[PDB]
């Protein structure tokens, strides 16, 4: 079921733990790679307990960014200056899911 609302932020409380602007938790499930310039990441919603907030030094290197953010036209800007496109965002069995892609650098 399509959803007409999107999150306006995603902090990184813990590695593989993102909190939107309403303090709900999103968890990444899988990462897809089709070629060098194509990367598609899948986000899932779930409620879990939160530990202490891991600091940036503890997080370490990663493929995903630290913070997204919504921009007009319906595109996200990560923290590495690259733009991410929204693929789809549906509800199934009461479970929220989202899919995002990495656009080629302009």
């Amino acid at each position: 079921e399509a959803v007409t609302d999107h999150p306006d932020r995603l902090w990184a409380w813990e590695k593989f733990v993102y909190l939107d602007e309403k303090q709900h938790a999103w968890l990444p499930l899988t990462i897809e790679i089709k070629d060098r310039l194509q990367l598609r990441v899948l986000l899932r919603r779930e409620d879990v307990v939160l530990g202490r907030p891991m600091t940036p030094t503890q997080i370490g290197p990663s493929l995903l960014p630290i913070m997204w953010q919504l921009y007009p036209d319906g595109r996200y800007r990560s923290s590495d200056s690259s733009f991410w496109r929204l693929v789809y965002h549906i509800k199934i069995d009461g479970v929220e899911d989202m899919l995002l892609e990495l656009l080629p650098d302009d």
């Binding site: 600091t55 940036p56 913070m67 921009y71 800007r77």
Partner: protein, 850 residues
């Protein structure tokens, strides 16, 4: 209509021998206020103490010949002349009102009317009566020379609520009234002129007529000139083609405006050849209004209509030989009209300027010619640009001038007129206050191509508070249109934003436009912006900008973890090209500071670093110093201005100085570190391998012990060359630093002692040192008491030798002959020495250079 003017006058009356003066813009209803007061006196509404009142009008008294004051005031009430002496025997129970001054001892002594009026205004006759004067601000000057200790009262007129009420009354239907009121209020400039009831009358009549005919009103209210033009076109019979009448009316309005007269008598109309038959059309059309109190008087509906007709005169075609008329008209020319001195002398031509610009369009001229059949001069487009020197000042225009020019250009509604004018702009400053200004700037500035700097500011009320939706949506749309300057112009190279009451959506749109690849910014600054997410968003947007090389952030913030993430990633990145970074008013815990300073270790481009107004608590400072002792740091400059520092941390600073290999500047202004800290630093400097070349200790609460330490440190072969001291005083130990200067091992080139509380007795030491030293090249003395005796002694001593000194700054008075002679002698014998004699400036040398 009643119940409104009464509502205004009731509150106005309460603000009031006493001398009262009323002043306000035309059409605001001062005469109604005075007449209401007089009627209240008649109806016994006022206090019973007012037993008699007299009405005097310059509108009529300007013509009547010499007579006695008793006869003058009894002319309109013959029956009272028998009681005039009895009435004037009670001067304390009399009220006098003088209406329309700008339009201009014995009561039984015959005298000229001007003399009588001057005497009464001076209280030479009936001193203990009450006076009340009504005049426009233009003529307020004379009352200052005439009146004695008067009081001034200001009128304002209708408000927004009364405008809405008037619209409701006129339209009757709620839907029509509210639609018209909204359409009018959409235009700020036309809304402001709506305070006068007559303007609201015109707007309501025009819009109602258009609505009853089923026409679109949106274009009508877009600009003033369209509205007035439509109304004028809708007030004369069809098919007549009254060219002559229109020319006559234009000429009459022009004469009236130039001469500063607001009323005309039948004789004046006769003088200009105005056939009285045409007065039927002029009146029944509501262009002229006949006064019903004093017969034989006429006036225009409102000032703005007179100005519009004046503009129509100037754009009207001029006939050959019209200079041969039998009268010497009081009419200027276009260049005189557009001159600034004429504007100041006669402030009522400013509006004629805007209207004339508005008439430069082609469609309006076509419609006017079709409706009336006149002929339009085609040289206006060139005559307006002949005064283009007003725009080609070769300097950035002030805010108000830019507002005026943009308003006129928007009135013109022709882009070809805007291009030739906005082409050469190179720097701009903007101060938005409402929607209309945003729309004007968007319309005009899109044609600029050489613009290079820009300073922005948004006032409160433009963007609605954070939570009406449509009201904010219109502003958002216009803002999006306005923010296209940054993306399109690829020469812009400097931006600044300060003291703006923005909202999240606007900031997001601005950043979206700033993140594109057609922008080539090179410097940025943010200062005191609200809300507090703006700083975080801006730090996010400016990551990876290839061109960016400066960046500043200031305000009151608290380091939320998200801000720490962004402000560390801004330096971690690999595309970073930064070269200078400043921070202000940022409060954070020692852990966040520790991780930030850890991140700095990886950066390989930063060169400056300022931390003014930020709290270190000395713990961040010790962490910073313990980070810098490592062998691979890269910072060169460093400034810790006003960071709550003491002598505790100075030891680590000395360790940094002795061990470092890249640090070559420093600054510690506004920190009472103390003589112990100075001692620690001096112990640091003594090491052979010290490489620091600059040092600043302005306003650091140092005493003579610190001066002794500094001299002891300098006595060796150090590498210091620049040193700046101020506020903190070295007077008693000044001889110590003079001895240090005498040392051949010194290498100082500059030295600043601005406001060091020095006494003239000590000039000997400085004179001897300057005569002895070989490397000093600049000295700065200010706010000292050596002005007279010190000048004498220093100039006498320095007359002996030609030292290397090039620039010497001190405060002097050039009114003394002996000091002048000494200065001339010194200059002649030392032509290579420049002496600044005007050190009175109360602005200290900042740390921007250092």
């Amino acid at each position: 209509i009643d119940n409104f003017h009464d509502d205004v006058t009731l509150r106005n009356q309460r603000f009031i021998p006493y001398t009262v003066v009323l002043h306000g813009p035309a059409g605001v209803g001062k005469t109604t206020l005075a007449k209401k007061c007089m009627l209240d006196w008649t109806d016994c509404n006022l206090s019973p103490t007012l037993r008699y009142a007299f009405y005097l009008s310059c509108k009529e008294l300007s013509r009547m010949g010499p007579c006695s004051f008793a006869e003058l005031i009894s002319k309109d009430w013959p029956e009272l002349q028998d009681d005039i002496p009895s009435i004037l025997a009670q001067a304390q129970r009399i009220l006098f009102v003088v209406d329309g001054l700008d339009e201009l001892g014995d009561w039984e002594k015959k005298k000229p009317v001007p003399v009588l009026l001057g005497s009464l205004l001076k209280r030479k006759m009936l001193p203990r009566a009450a006076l009340l004067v009504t005049t426009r601000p233009r003529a307020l000057r004379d009352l200052q020379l005439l009146a004695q200790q008067p009081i001034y009262v200001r009128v304002e007129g209708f408000l927004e609520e009364d405008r809405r009420a008037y619209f409701l009354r006129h339209f009757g239907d709620e839907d029509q009234a509210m639609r018209a009121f909204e359409l009018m209020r959409s235009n700020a400039a036309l809304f402001q002129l709506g305070s006068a009831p007559a303007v609201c009358w015109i707007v309501c009549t025009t819009l109602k007529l258009q609505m009853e005919k089923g026409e679109d009103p949106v274009p009508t209210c877009l600009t003033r000139t369209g509205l007035f033009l439509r109304f004028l076109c809708s007030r004369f019979p069809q098919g007549a083609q009254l060219r002559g009448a229109l020319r006559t009316l234009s000429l009459l309005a022009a004469q009236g405006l130039w001469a500063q007269m607001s009323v005309f008598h039948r004789e004046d109309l006769e003088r200009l050849g105005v056939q009285e038959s045409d007065l039927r059309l002029f009146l029944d059309g509501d262009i002229l209004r006949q006064d019903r109190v004093s017969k034989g008087c006429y006036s225009f509906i409102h000032l703005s209509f007179q100005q519009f007709l004046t503009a129509l005169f100037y754009a009207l075609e001029k006939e050959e030989g019209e200079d041969r008329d039998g009268h010497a008209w009081d009419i200027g020319d276009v260049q005189k009209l557009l001159s600034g001195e004429e504007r100041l002398k006669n402030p009522d031509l400013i509006q004629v300027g805007h209207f004339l610009f508005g008439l430069a369009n082609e469609k309006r001229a076509k419609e006017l010619e079709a409706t009336f059949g006149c002929r339009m001069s085609p040289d206006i487009k060139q005559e307006l640009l002949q005064c283009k020197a007003h725009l080609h000042a070769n300097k950035p225009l002030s805010v108000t001038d830019l507002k005026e020019v943009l308003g006129c250009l928007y009135e013109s509604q022709e882009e070809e007129l805007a291009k030739v004018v906005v082409a050469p702009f190179k720097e701009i400053s903007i101060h938005l206050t409402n929607t209309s200004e945003v729309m004007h700037c968007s319309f005009s500035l899109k044609h600029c191509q050489d613009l290079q700097k820009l300073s922005l500011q948004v006032a409160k009320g433009v963007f609605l508070e954070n939570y009406w939706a449509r009201q904010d949506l219109r502003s958002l749309r216009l803002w999006t249109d306005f923010c296209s300057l940054f993306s399109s112009n690829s020469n812009l190279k400097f931006l600044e934003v300060k003291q703006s009451f923005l909202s999240d959506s606007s900031v997001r749109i601005l950043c979206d436009h700033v993140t594109r690849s057609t922008c080539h910014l090179q410097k940025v600054e943010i200062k005191n912006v609200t809300p507090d997410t703006a700083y975080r968003d801006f730090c996010l947007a400016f990551i990876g900008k290839k061109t960016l090389t400066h960046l500043t952030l200031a305000g009151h913030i608290e380091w939320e973890r998200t801000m720490m993430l962004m402000l560390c990633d801004l330096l971690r990145n690999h595309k970073c090209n930064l070269q200078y970074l400043r921070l202000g008013g940022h409060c954070a815990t020692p852990e966040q500071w520790a991780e930030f300073f850890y991140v700095l270790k990886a950066n390989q481009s930063l060169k400056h670093l300022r931390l003014s107004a930020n709290v270190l608590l000395d713990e961040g400072a010790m962490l910073l110093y313990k980070t810098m002792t490592r062998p691979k740091h890269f910072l060169q400059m460093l400034s810790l201005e006003n960071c709550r520092l003491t002598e505790a941390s100075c030891k680590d600073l000395a360790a940094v100085l002795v061990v470092s290999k890249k640090l070559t500047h420093l600054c510690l202004a506004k920190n009472p570190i103390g003589d112990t800290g100075v001692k620690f630093l001096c112990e640091g400097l003594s090491y052979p391998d010290c490489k620091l070349q600059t040092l600043v200790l302005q306003q650091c609460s140092i005493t003579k012990l610190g001066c002794r330490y500094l001299s002891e440190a300098l006595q060796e072969a150090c590498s210091l060359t620049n040193l700046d001291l101020s506020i903190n005083q070295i007077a008693r130990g000044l001889w110590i630093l003079c001895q240090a200067l005498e040392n051949p091992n010194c290498n100082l080139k500059h030295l600043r002692l601005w406001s060091c509380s020095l006494m003239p007795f000590y000039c000997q030491h400085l004179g001897s040192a300057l005569l002895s030293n070989q490397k000093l090249e600049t000295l700065d003395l200010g706010q000292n008491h050596l002005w007279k005796s010190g000048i004498i002694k220093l100039f006498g001593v320095l007359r002996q030798r030609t030292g290397s000194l090039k620039i010497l700054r001190l405060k002097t008075y050039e009114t003394n002959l002996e000091i002048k002679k000494l200065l001339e002698e010194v200059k002649e014998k030392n032509p290579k020495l420049t002496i600044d004699c005007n050190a009175s400036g109360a602005t200290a040398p900042p740390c921007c250079d250092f």
